[PDB]
Design a protein around this ligand. Structure first.
Ligand SMILES: Cc1cc2nc3c(=O)[nH]c(=O)nc-3n(C[C@H](O)[C@H](O)[C@H](O)COP(=O)(O)OP(=O)(O)OC[C@H]3O[C@@H](n4cnc5c(N)ncnc54)[C@H](O)[C@@H]3O)c2cc1C
Ligand SMILES: O=C(Cc1nn[nH]n1)c1ccc(-c2ccccc2)cc1
Ligand SMILES: [Cl-]
Length: 451
């Protein structure tokens, strides 16, 4: 039986543990945090994640989809809150079977942890990876008190998140070619209670967006009708725009309150604990980290956030991580040897990871900026018309990323063709009546092969 050691009992690490263990691998999984299934008196605070078809299919392959969806809120569309107009529901995809699921991250982790153990994996909590000796095939783990433990390993899977200790160890023996692209936006997570969401008739079965240009809020529903709200806002005000909102100008909750009353007037009444949450929850940081290589020979490999930290603006980090896990398990299971498996996995997934990294960054202006420009609405109106005329050729990029399993690289490649096509077609035209619909449809057939 082939052996594997996995660092990080997160989403990708527990899914790949289950997939390999049920295939007969001997799987040991080490996690720095305690087991969240051991109930304590602490008040856990979990965010929700948007689970899309990519992630759902990965869970489906693992035999865990029904259990996860049993605990997920169905989001049938986007509820767009734009000042001046009532909230507008934009249904997802083209049919009523295309939805996104709001799943509590802790609920999901417990389902995955149970699933990995049922398949035969052994999970060891309260043990953080400190170092790896690749030449001697040994690694060093320690608890929170620093007591150290050495283990031999045969195959090392770094599924240990955006601050991967496995990545750090690999960069000591191989040039990973790291390029860190810092993001000027931070985020703050806020909360709407079930009482508040009911009192203001906030729709539970939808994903809510408050676009506002350089900043925005979004909210995802929980089973108990609470919502977790995320504010995206610049860390610092630029010198060019010294009065522009930023976290540095919100020194306390009272400043935050006045800011929300002015810029999010229909949302502020629902944020009962805005002041307390703002000061007691830390401001998160966002970054994109691109690596040229994800593996060291056949000894170690990265996946998930360990391999490709990305901005959350597309709701695809978890979905990509689960897709990564399926691909890595497939390659390891059928390859001639671990070295071939890790090279083939990297060669398959690295261009797709770059794609979703770039599309997630681009999708920020799509949510907050590109909703009030006249050209955008005519392009989307023309994009929907082309999606009906050529449904196997023109699929909007959001639907390809979210509701299909087409490789991220093809989704971005086809999306660029589609975006330029719509851009040229609507240029110097103000109405759909002044646009020739068969000329755009002919370009769809010339430049977009059917799927
Ligand atoms: C604010 C925010 C919102 C997001 N929203 C979405 C969304 O709506 N949809 C979506 O698809 N994605 C979303 N994402 C992205 C998603 O959360 C991550 O991409 C996903 O969790 C990656 O899974 P992973 O298993 O690679 O890493 P993680 O889930 O972070 O797991 C890493 C694990 O490794 C452990 N670990 C770390 N270091 C060590 C060590 N040295 N030794 C041992 N164990 C270690 C950690 O404790 C953790 O258990 C969001 C991210 C953020 C920050
Ligand atoms: O589903 C999406 C993509 C989308 N783009 N336009 N409308 N939504 C989506 C985008 C972002 C998130 C998210 C990010 C950080 C924190 C909390 C949630 C969730 C989900
Ligand atoms: Cl993400």
């Amino acid at each position: 039986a082939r052996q594997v050691t996995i660092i990080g009992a997160g989403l990708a690490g527990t899914l790949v543990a289950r997939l390999l263990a049920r295939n007969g691998w001997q799987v040991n999984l080490f996690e720095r945090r305690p087991d969240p299934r051991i109930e304590t008196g602490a008040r856990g605070r979990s965010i929700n994640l948007a689970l899309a078809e990519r992630g759902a299919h990965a869970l489906r392959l693992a035999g865990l989809e029904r259990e996860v969806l049993a605990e997920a809120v169905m989001m049938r569309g986007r509820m767009v809150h734009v000042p001046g107009t009532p909230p507008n529901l934009q249904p997802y995809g083209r049919d009523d079977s295309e939805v996104i699921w709001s799943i509590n991250r802790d609920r999901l982790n417990r389902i995955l942890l149970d699933g990995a153990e049922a398949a035969g994996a052994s999970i060891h909590f309260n043990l953080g990876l400190d170092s790896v000796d690749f030449a001697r095939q040994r690694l060093t783990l320690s608890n929170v008190s620093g007591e150290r433990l050495e283990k031999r390993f045969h195959l090392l899977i770094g599924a240990d998140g955006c601050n991967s200790a496995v990545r750090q160890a690999m960069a000591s023996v191989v040039d990973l070619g790291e390029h860190l692209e810092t993001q000027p936006h931070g985020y703050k997570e806020l909360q709407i209670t079930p009482e508040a969401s009911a009192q203001f008739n906030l729709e539970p079965n939808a994903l809510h967006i408050w676009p506002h240009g350089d900043y925005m809020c979004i909210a995802l529903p929980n089973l108990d009708r609470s919502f977790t709200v995320t504010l995206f806002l610049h860390h610092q005000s630029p010198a060019a725009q010294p009065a522009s909102p930023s976290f540095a100008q919100l020194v306390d909750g009272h400043a935050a309150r006045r800011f929300f009353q002015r810029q999010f007037p229909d949302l502020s009444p629902m944020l009962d604990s805005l002041e307390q949450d703002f000061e007691h929850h830390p401001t998160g940081k966002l970054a994109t980290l691109r690596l040229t290589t994800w593996h060291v020979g056949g000894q170690a490999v990265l996946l998930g956030d360990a391999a490709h930290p990305m901005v959350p603006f597309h709701g695809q980090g978890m979905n990509c991580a689960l897709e990564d896990a399926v691909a890595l398990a497939e390659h390891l299971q059928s390859a001639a040897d671990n070295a071939s498996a890790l090279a083939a996995f990297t060669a398959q997934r690295q261009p797709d990871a770059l794609a979703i990294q770039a599309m997630a960054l681009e999708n920020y202006v799509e949510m907050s900026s590109k909703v009030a420009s006249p050209t955008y609405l005519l392009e989307r109106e023309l994009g929907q018309i082309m999606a009906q005329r050529q449904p196997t050729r023109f699929i909007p990029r959001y639907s390809m990323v979210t509701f299909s399993r087409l490789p991220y690289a093809q989704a971005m490649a086809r999306g660029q063709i589609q975006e330029q096509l719509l851009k040229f077609a609507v240029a110097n035209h103000s109405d759909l009546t002044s646009i020739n619909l068969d000329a755009v449809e002919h370009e769809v057939t010339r430049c977009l092969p059917p799927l």
